[PDB]
Write a protein that binds this DNA or RNA. Structure first.
Length: 10
DNA sequence: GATGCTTC
DNA sequence: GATGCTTC
C-alpha cells in the first residue's frame, strides 16, 4: 500500500 | 525493521 | 501470478 503501507496498487 | 493491498 | 516503496 501507499507508498507506504504502492496504492494499492502500483 | 514495519510494511501493505490493489489493479493489472 | 505481478505489482509497488514509502514513511513510520
Amino acid at each position: 500500500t501507499x507508498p507506504g503501507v504502492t496504492x494499492p496498487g502500483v
